[PDB]
Specification:
- This is part of a larger assembly, with chains A (292 residues) and B (259 residues).
- Chain A has 292 residues and is α/β, with parallel strands linked by helices.
- Chain A has helices at 3-16, 22-35, 42-59, 63-82, 86-105, 107-115, 132-143, 160-169, 183-186, 212-221, 248-251, 280-290; strands at 124-127, 149-153, 175-178, 192-195, 199-200, 206-209, 226-229, 260-263, 270-273, 276-278.
- In chain A, the strands form two sheets. A seven-stranded mixed beta sheet of chain A has the order 3-2-1-4-7-9-10, with helices on both faces. Chain A has a three-stranded antiparallel beta sheet with strand order 5-6-8.
- In chain A, α8 links the parallel β2 and β3 (175-178).
- In chain A, α2 (22-35) packs parallel to α4 (63-82) and α2 runs antiparallel to α5.
- Chain A is elongated and about 60 Å long.
- The two termini of chain A are 32 Å apart.
- Chain B has one domain (57-259).
- Chain B has helices at residues 9-23, 31-62, 78-90, 107-117, 129-132, 158-167, 250-258; strands spanning 70-74, 95-100, 121-125, 138-142, 145-146, 152-155, 172-175, 227-230, 237-240, 243-245.
- In chain B, α2 packs across α3 (78-90) and α3 runs parallel beside α4.
- Chain B is globular.
- Classes of the chains: A alpha/beta (292), B alpha/beta (259).
- Chains A and B meet through loops of A and loops of B.
Chain lengths: 292, 259
């Protein structure tokens, strides 16, 4: 499989279904690459998959793509540990990959059904920018016949907050748009903050759009619960010590304008994943359980 | 009088004022004139420091009370009751949450007042306060004394309410007349306090009193604290006849009232 057709398949699966996220598209492209590789050794298989992951992360500078890459490499490593013969291992891999794709396709609805019960009637929800998982949880909460008012931040560098407001008014949910600088002004009117995450780091913190850290610190200062809804495949084994420790491949190209920031686990109340409702300390355990 | 019961801060300030006024009486002054002037000075002190001060504090607090807000009060305070009554009379519409504590249960007094004024009211004990603070918008607390460092000396449990209100992002307002301002400082409730009668802690639960004959147990002790101290960091605003000030401005008032 050529590099050009790899990028073409990635872009085609991203464009065909805008609802589906970037990490799922990357994992699908990697599984499609593994589908037709015409190889005979698992060593070259691993090397080719790693190179495909590097070029895919070259296409998109998101943390979720790299998360999916490491998760997929671990999946191949475990499958190889199960079976030594290349043909049996490869067929086991393709069936397991199909099951994995099926399970990660429906994570959003599980997170919605597990998180919509934390919204109360007459609550005031603050969210940062556009995130399909937050849209899904709010849709499920509305389907639960609950009435609430949503606040959203315009998300200045690309106005995805306005897109969130439009996609929320589509279902006639009362929503409001505030500036990036008005977040500290709005915290006291909101009851809880719900955000997504492009990547969940080892210690339980998150990587997200540049304005997430401000909301986390403001909510902590005003004693408001901070909920993060994120998928399992966004679990990177990263340990940022500060904002400078975040890898530069995720900050830029996605005066000086970073596109992401890191939020410490002490500023997060609970994480809503397809694994369930977890404390941040659980996430690390998961990773420790994954890599032996 | 101190032997009958330890003197309060207001009584201490009144004693200071009366001693200063008696010392200021000249020797050449006639005895009848001196006595009449002393009585008139006491009457004027009562008037200015209580009645006009309460009216000014009510007018000041009217601007901080809006329609549809929930105000939390603790125990019994004449200033708080007057503030709420005049706020309701002038046309503000709101509801009040009354918090009470054992064994005095003075909050019931305030409750009755509110019921006789037409103000909607709720009643609960202090341990349940954290349950009701989510729906509370402002906390209005009376003060027995304001200390030179900004701390609020009040009925035991007031600092509890201030801490729990800060935990719920609820502003805490203290109303106090400037004649209750004290030059002394106090960091905790142990160094200076009052011990009430321990037998008041006995309560009839079911058909037996568990604390009956509690002195028969050598290692058993009963503690009945009267006062506690609220640090200035737990108070958002002080309402006085001078106006709305921060706690850090309490010494400033003490500077301008003295001279």
């Amino acid at each position: 499989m050529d590099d050009k057709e790899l990028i073409e398949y990635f872009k085609s699966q991203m464009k065909e279904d805008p609802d589906m996220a970037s990490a799922v598209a990357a994992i699908r492209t990697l599984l499609e690459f593994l589908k037709r590789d015409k190889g005979e050794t698992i060593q070259g298989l691993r090397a080719n998959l790693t190179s495909a992951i590097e070029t895919l992360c070259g296409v998109d500078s998101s943390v979720a793509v790299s998360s999916g890459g490491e998760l997929f490499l671990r999946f191949i490593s475990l499958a190889s540990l199960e079976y030594s013969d290349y043909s049996k291992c490869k067929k086991i891999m393709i069936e397991r990959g199909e099951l994995f794709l099926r399970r990660i396709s429906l994570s959003r609805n599980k997170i919605a059904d597990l998180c919509h019960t934390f919204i109360k009637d007459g609550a005031t929800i603050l969210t940062h920018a556009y995130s399909r998982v937050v849209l899904r949880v709010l849709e499920a909460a509305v389907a639960a016949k609950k009435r609430f008012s949503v606040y959203v931040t315009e998300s200045q560098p690309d106005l995805s907050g306005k897109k969130m407001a439009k996609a929320l008014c589509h279902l006639n949910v009362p929503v409001t748009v505030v500036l990036d600088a008005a977040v500290g002004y709005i915290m006291e009117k909101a009851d809880l903050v719900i955000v997504g995450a492009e990547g969940v780091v080892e210690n339980g913190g998150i990587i997200n759009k540049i304005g997430t850290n401000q909301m986390a610190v403001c909510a902590k200062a005003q004693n408001k619960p901070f909920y993060v809804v994120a998928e399992s495949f966004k679990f990177v084994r990263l340990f940022p010590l500060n904002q400078q420790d975040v890898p530069d491949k995720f900050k830029y190209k996605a005066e000086e304008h970073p596109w992401v920031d890191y939020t410490a686990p002490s500023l997060i109340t609970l994480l809503f994943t397809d694994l369930g409702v977890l404390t941040p300390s659980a996430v690390s355990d998961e990773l420790i359980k994954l890599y032996l | 009088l101190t032997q009958c019961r330890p003197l309060s801060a207001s009584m201490h300030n009144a004693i200071k004022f009366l001693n200063k006024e008696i010392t200021s009486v000249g020797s050449s002054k006639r005895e009848e004139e001196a006595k009449s002037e002393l009585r008139a000075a006491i009457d004027r002190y009562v008037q200015e420091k209580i009645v006009l001060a309460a009216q000014a504090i009510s007018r000041f607090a009217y601007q901080k009370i809006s329609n549809g807000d929930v105000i939390l009060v603790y125990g019994c305070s004449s200033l708080v009751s007057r503030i709420l009554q005049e706020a309701w009379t002038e046309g503000r519409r709101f509801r009040v949450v009354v918090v009470d504590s054992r064994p005095w249960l003075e909050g019931r007094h305030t409750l009755r007042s509110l019921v006789h004024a037409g103000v909607p009211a709720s009643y609960l004990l202090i341990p349940a306060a954290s349950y009701v603070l989510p729906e509370v918008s402002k906390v209005l607390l009376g003060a027995h004394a304001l200390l030179a460092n900004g701390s609020v000396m009040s009925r035991v449990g007031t600092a509890q309410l201030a801490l729990v209100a800060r935990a719920h992002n609820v502003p805490v307002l203290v109303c106090c007349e400037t004649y209750k301002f004290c030059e002394r400082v106090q960091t905790d409730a142990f160094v200076s306090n009052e011990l009430d009668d321990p037998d008041d802690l006995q309560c009839k639960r079911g058909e037996h009193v568990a604390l009956a004959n509690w002195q028969n147990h050598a290692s058993l002790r009963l503690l009945n604290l009267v006062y506690d101290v609220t640090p200035p960091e737990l108070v958002d605003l002080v309402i006085t006849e001078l106006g709305m000030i921060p706690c850090s401005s309490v010494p400033v008032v003490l500077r301008v009232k003295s001279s």
